[PDB]
Design a protein around this ligand. Structure first.
Ligand code: ADP
Ligand code: ADP
Ligand code: TMP
Ligand code: TMP
Ligand code: F
Ligand code: F
Ligand code: F
Ligand code: MG
Lengths: 194, 194
């Protein structure tokens, strides 16, 4: 089965995704953890380009999808055939919220591309780690990570609208402490996974 | 002004596009010559991936389009704004013929990606260097290069259908000799540039 972590930078997705991965493996599930973009050899190359080069937003959209395509074909689709629990650090909702809201690209066009790159694979549940931008920015500032407050505020809202509109999204209060946020994720998952 | 060479591998695109580059430059035009994929730094990185790594067809489609977004916004749109003659070695018809007619992906979906990546920029004329696969393959083997007969036959017919179904496309008989082929190209150009 498939579990997506979503939300803005600094909401704790890397942290919780890895905590869920270890937790679920200890309980006997065969589990996978992938990040987006990245997660394959080609995908990580694309990731380094996305994070390093100066790119217009259209080329950006195409490479995020190129990473996703390779991840879906090479690892996700097989993993799910073997009944692995696949954990994603970001998925299709990140693209809509960042490139749609955020960058201003057409939401329906982004969706068509998501569907193309995913072959229509969708999560059993998406965990939206929602957090106020000013709090996420303080968290990132401690590791010397700077992100754009005006940009991330639009993006937070997009995630919230998507959580109302798309299926199987649970809003998590990510401003809590690491153990409380993880307990709230466990309750959210209790609906679909033992 | 925008001039695009299209056609199967080994049809003389590289050769004639450079012939035309030197020709127009001697006659006083400011000219650019770009290849697809490639033509920019990021575009050349993706070209080396597309050529050397084992990719599924969907990831391929997205990378070909990503290289094209980069070339359009970084170079072609500025070039055209300065009234440069831009000569492309492969453009949007190559994606339709290879990824659509060749590998079976949806041509309307491809044409939507084309439009998104080009921002609606279309050539003034496209030169299809039509040639029988057998000849092309022979020329290619002489330079120690081998391509897939069964695949190119589909791609050639795709190019010919687009020459009818698309706009501003002239079919060049590229089986002739180099000066013979360039002579039909100049003829085709004279209804566009002088
Ligand atoms: N619940 C939490 N409370 C406070 N800080 C946290 C919490 N979870 C993670 N962090 C810290 O916040 C920073 C960003 O978290 P990370 O998991 O990398 O977020 P994301 O992957 O969503 O950007 C890291 O330095 C991390 O140690
Ligand atoms: N008119 C021609 N007749 C015979 N051989 C040619 C002709 N034009 C080019 N060639 C040779 O065929 C090979 C492929 O040409 P090239 O322009 O690289 O084709 P493409 O770019 O379409 O792959 C090159 O080695 C070139 O020297
Ligand atoms: C997967 C994805 C990530 N991103 C952003 C999110 C991050 O700011 C950045 C790198 O992601 P990360 O910090 O979570 O690893 O790429 C998008 O804008 N669109 C997308 O589709
Ligand atoms: C521009 C483009 C090229 N190709 C193929 C054509 C070539 O076989 C291959 C390398 O290009 P080249 O031989 O013309 O240099 O990339 C596609 O499949 N789709 C595309 O959109
Ligand atoms: F993340
Ligand atoms: F990450
Ligand atoms: F991160
Ligand atoms: Mg991360």
């Amino acid at each position: 089965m498939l579990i997506a972590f979503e939300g803005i930078d600094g909401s704790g997705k890397t942290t919780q995704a890895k905590k869920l991965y270890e937790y679920l493996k200890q309980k006997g599930y065969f589990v996978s953890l992938y990040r987006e973009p990245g997660g394959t050899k080609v995908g990580e190359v694309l990731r380094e380009i996305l994070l390093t080069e100066e790119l217009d937003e259209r080329t950006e959209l195409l490479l995020f999808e190129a990473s996703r395509s390779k991840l879906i074909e090479e690892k996700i689709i097989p993993d799910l055939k073997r009944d692995k629990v696949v954990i994603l650090d970001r998925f299709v909702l990140s693209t809509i919220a960042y490139q749609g809201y955020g960058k201003g690209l057409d939401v329906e066009f982004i969706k068509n591309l998501n569907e193309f790159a995913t072959r229509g694979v969708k999560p059993d549940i998406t965990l939206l780690l929602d957090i106020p931008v000013d709090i996420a920015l303080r968290r990132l500032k401690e590791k010397n990570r700077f992100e754009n407050k005006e940009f991330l505020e639009k993006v937070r809202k997009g995630f919230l609208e998507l959580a109302k509109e798309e299926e199987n999204v649970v809003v998590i209060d990510a401003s809590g402490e690491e153990e409380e946020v993880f307990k709230e994720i466990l309750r959210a998952l209790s609906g679909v996974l033992r």
